[PDB]
């Protein structure tokens, strides 16, 4: 198996405009979103096809309620920093919880919280402590660290609740989230070298050029790996070419255990 | 999902008594302890989500996930220790599973 | 600080009567529960409101309704009353729901006896 992860979002906004929702919450298993909930729907509902087929309406009726009970404490919980910043007008609340199933079958977990999109508390669940940014975050982990039975839950959802959820996720979704579709890849002249790849699943993807058998990494212009919509991903890696002298430059991909080299003539 | 612990114990006065809570769980999110005097409401004596023995005065609590199984030691005991003793455990969905409950009759 | 406080104590009921069970809260709970006891099992949920503005039913609603009027109450409602609902109804409450270790806090237990 490759590295997988799951991960919940939590986002609260606090004078949103009239029609954005105050609260939003999606899980996503690695880059797919498999769950959504919103302040303005009131319910939990799949966002990936294989979720809805394996998860019963009772589920779905269960995480709502929950959910709905979280939108009202993180509403609290951004009152309760706005008031303590002294911020006027709307600022924005974000949450971020997940685990790793790493290849090696090590596995990772993380929780933290951020403020107007900066990180404000990081939970370090080795040492059971939080990391605060301020001391509005200061204060606020005095508190948590005070429910010393809070942090414990933390360190055990994270270290096997996650990753019993991912690998059932996994399982439930093999056929989209364990199949390989090998990229596509060209060489062409626009002056630099474009080295393009599109087609392939999982969107990990290395791509870099080799100068006469070596890398030079501050030469090369790395593109982001982007969605193409049907499901698959492209990307590109770009360099310059030496106008006073001829180079044997040679793109290099690797994606899912097999490695590519296009030799440009 | 199940929860069982034992119906009845008996101990004497100054001794100590062992309560066992084995539990068949989908996910496992913590164990609780409380104990209920008759005619009266239960409350909350412990809390264990991770492996080992946290201790409260006289009162001490086990748990081990992976054999799926918790007790709540009571040392020194006392007449005002009779009473029932309730284990439940969260779930994977945050509901709590209750056990029947354990009456513990103490000799004096 | 009275904690949680239900009332009826004790009431006796002919099948088919009506009956509401009340339960208040001055510690500023979210999450409000209605369980009943019987002899030989463990503690069932009825329903539960996770938070004011929400219900949702329990293991065993059959027979039952509930109103969380506001954060602080949180009724039962028995329309028809059944000699099956004889039973010890306790009402419990916490700061949240989702939130993991927390504990509940009981109401002191209503006995109802449903004759025939």
């Known amino acids: 198996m490759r590295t997988h992860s799951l991960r919940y979002f939590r986002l609260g906004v606090s004078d949103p405009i009239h029609g954005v929702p105050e609260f939003i919450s999606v899980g996503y298993v690695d880059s797919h979103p498999i769950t959504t909930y919103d302040s303005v729907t009131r319910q939990k509902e799949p966002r990936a096809p294989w979720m809805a087929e394996n998860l019963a309406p009772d589920h779905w009726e269960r995480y709502t309620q929950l959910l709905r009970g979280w939108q009202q404490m993180f509403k609290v919980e951004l009152k309760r920093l706005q008031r303590h910043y002294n911020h006027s007008g709307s600022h924005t609340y974000q949450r971020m919880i997940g685990c790793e199933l790493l290849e090696d079958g090590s596995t990772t977990g993380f929780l933290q919280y951020a403020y107007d999109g900066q990180d404000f508390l990081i939970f370090n669940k080795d040492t059971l402590s939080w990391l605060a940014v301020d001391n509005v975050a200061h204060t606020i982990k005095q508190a948590w660290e005070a429910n010393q039975h809070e942090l414990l839950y933390q360190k055990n959802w994270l270290e096997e609740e996650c990753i019993a959820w991912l690998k059932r996720f996994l399982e439930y979704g093999k056929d989209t989230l364990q199949r390989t579709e090998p990229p596509l890849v060209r060489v062409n002249r626009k002056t630099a070298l474009f080295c393009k790849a599109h087609g392939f699943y999982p969107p990990e993807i290395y791509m870099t050029w080799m100068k006469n058998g070596e890398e030079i990494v501050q030469e090369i212009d790395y593109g982001d790996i982007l969605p193409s919509g049907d499901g698959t991903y492209q990307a590109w890696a770009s360099i310059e070419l030496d106008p006073q002298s001829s180079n044997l430059y040679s793109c290099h991909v690797e994606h899912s255990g097999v490695h590519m080299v296009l030799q440009v003539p | 999902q199940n929860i069982d612990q034992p119906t009845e114990m008996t101990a004497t006065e100054g001794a100590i008594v062992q309560i066992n809570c084995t539990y068949q769980?989908?996910?496992?999110?913590?164990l609780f302890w409380y104990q209920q005097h008759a005619g009266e409401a239960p409350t909350f004596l412990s809390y264990?989500?991770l492996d080992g023995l946290e201790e409260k005065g006289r009162f001490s609590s086990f748990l081990s996930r992976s054999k799926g199984y918790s007790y709540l030691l009571l040392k020194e005991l006392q007449m005002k220790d009779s009473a029932s003793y309730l284990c439940?455990?969260?779930?994977?969905?945050?509901?709590?599973?209750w056990g029947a409950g354990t009456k513990l009759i103490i000799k004096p | 600080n009275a904690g949680v406080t239900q009332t009826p104590k004790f009431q006796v009921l002919k099948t088919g009567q009506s009956m509401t069970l009340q339960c208040a809260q001055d510690?500023?709970?979210?999450?409000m529960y209605w369980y009943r006891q019987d002899p030989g099992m463990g503690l069932r949920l009825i329903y539960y409101?996770?938070?004011?503005?929400?219900?949702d039913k329990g293991e065993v609603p059959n027979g039952y309704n509930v109103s969380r009027l506001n954060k602080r109450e949180f009724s039962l409602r028995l329309e028809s009353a059944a000699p099956s609902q004889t039973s010890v109804y306790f009402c419990?409450?916490?700061?949240?729901?989702?939130?993991?270790?927390?504990?509940?806090?009981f109401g002191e237990g209503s006995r109802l006896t449903v004759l025939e």
């Open positions: 510690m500023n709970h979210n999450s």
């Open positions: 409101s996770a938070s004011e503005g929400t219900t």
């Open positions: 264990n989500v």
């Open positions: 419990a409450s916490s700061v949240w729901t989702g939130e993991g270790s927390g504990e509940l806090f």
């Open positions: 439940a455990v969260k779930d994977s969905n945050y509901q709590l599973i």
């Open positions: 769980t989908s996910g496992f999110n913590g």
